[PDB]
Antibody, heavy 219, light 211 residues
């Protein structure tokens, strides 16, 4: 009932421009000190900008001149305008709420991943990893989905639209020699009920706004 | 700008141990110091604010101390779910800055992997590529070795592997390996096998199939 959810991330060419949005529920952006903070390997977590309730904005030195934080109170959404993106701007971007204006970051969003590169987006192919006598052990059966050949990151995968989370393992993606990513997601379930339950992996690759629902059938 | 340091970079401990991690500011920051917990793929979560105040709903086994330039966070009965990277953060001078983080892992009993193998899907085969996948499930410690064998001949250079983060419930890991061949190459051999070595097994395990 009280959360933050970011959107807008994806592939952007150097010098390009992107707009991130962040929709709040359970509180009003117009009466809160909202911040953007990013994270990437090397520099770790990095504060980027803030907008006060009254409206003052402040920016980190590394994005002064290029980024602009804003909010529309009608939609209760918060925005980060990103111009003239550079290689080093690749990061997960989080919006975060603070109190007291002294910066605590008490509530964060899920994050949205921005990849600055000159390559091209490619959506994945999804193939079932079907349960069979070679993926059963002691009454348990393994099954999964293989999410092959996409760029850039990330791919997210749900099972049964979010209703199946026990026993799921979505593996970190690997970089294939083609420069494309591949990942697998698997689940273990009872063997005895493979004939009566249905298992569907939901694959979302928002950088190429691609969505695939793949029923995984026993072999 | 204030530089925030943290030690150790990581540590391992068992369930019930008490663990203390440290954070140093380059100069005095009073008690303007916050602690965050983050697990891989998830957003940070505020644990302690103003050096020693528990955020609402944090278990009492977390506590923080310090003032000036040295600060500590202490967990008294380490639980499997406390697996994470912990970040400290100052707000005394602009701009606020974060430490590089300390990773807390957990030890547990040796557990041998369960091993499964998946032949390529026909959907993929008709596109001319054959991926064969080997799954190692729920093992500990994380060190494990997979070898691919086609018609009993060891392979190199055509596989890739990836290990999960540590499970927040049972403190195990899982591992996925994929062997990728062309449809032409795939259809010229009979038996496909992944061979698994791990400290929980006295002899390497092999899962295979024909076709």
């Amino acid at each position: 009932q009280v959360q933050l959810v970011e959107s807008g991330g994806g592939l952007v060419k150097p010098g390009g421009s992107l707009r991130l949005s962040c929709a709040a529920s359970g509180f009003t952006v117009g009466s809160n000190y909202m911040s953007w903070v990013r994270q990437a390997p090397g520099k770790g977590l990095e504060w980027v900008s803030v907008i006060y309730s009254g409206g003052s904005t402040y920016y980190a030195d590394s994005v002064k001149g290029r980024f602009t934080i804003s909010r529309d109170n009608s939609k209760n959404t918060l925005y980060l305008q990103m111009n003239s993106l550079r290689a080093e701007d690749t990061a997960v971007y989080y919006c975060a709420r603070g109190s007291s204006g002294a910066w605590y970051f008490d509530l964060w969003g899920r994050g949205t991943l921005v990849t600055v590169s000159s390559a091209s987006t490619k959506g994945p192919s999804v193939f079932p990893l079907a349960p069979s006598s070679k993926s059963t052990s002691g009454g348990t059966a393994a099954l999964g989905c293989l999410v092959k050949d996409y760029f850039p990151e990330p791919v997210t995968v749900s099972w049964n639209s979010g209703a199946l989370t026990s026993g799921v393992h979505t593996f970190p993606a690997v970089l294939q020699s083609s420069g494309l990513y591949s990942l697998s997601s698997v689940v273990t379930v009872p063997s005895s009920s493979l004939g009566t339950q249905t298992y569907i992996c939901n694959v979302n690759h928002k950088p190429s706004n691609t969505k695939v629902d793949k029923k995984v059938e026993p072999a | 700008e204030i530089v925030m340091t943290q030690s150790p970079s990581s540590l391992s401990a068992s369930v019930g141990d008490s663990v203390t991690i440290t954070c140093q500011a380059s100069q005095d920051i009073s008690n303007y110091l916050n602690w965050y917990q983050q697990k891989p793929g998830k957003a940070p979560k505020l644990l302690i604010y103003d050096a020693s105040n528990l955020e609402t709903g944090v278990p009492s086994r977390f506590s923080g101390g310090g003032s000036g330039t040295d600060f500590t966070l202490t967990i008294t009965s380490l639980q499997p779910e406390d697996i994470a990277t912990y970040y400290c953060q100052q707000y005394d001078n602009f701009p606020p800055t974060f430490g590089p983080g300390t990773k807390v892992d957990i030890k547990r009993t040796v557990a041998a992997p369960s091993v499964f193998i998946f032949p390529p899907s026909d959907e993929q085969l008709k596109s001319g590529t054959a991926s064969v996948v080997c799954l190692l499930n729920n093992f500990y410690p994380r060190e494990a070795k997979v070898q691919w064998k086609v018609d009993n001949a060891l392979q190199s250079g055509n596989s890739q592997e990836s290990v999960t983060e540590q499970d927040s419930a049972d403190s195990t890991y899982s591992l996925s390996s994929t062997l990728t061949l062309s449809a032409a190459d795939y259809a010229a051999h009979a038996v496909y096998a992944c061979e698994v070595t791990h400290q929980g097994l006295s002899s390497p395990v092999t899962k295979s199939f024909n076709r």
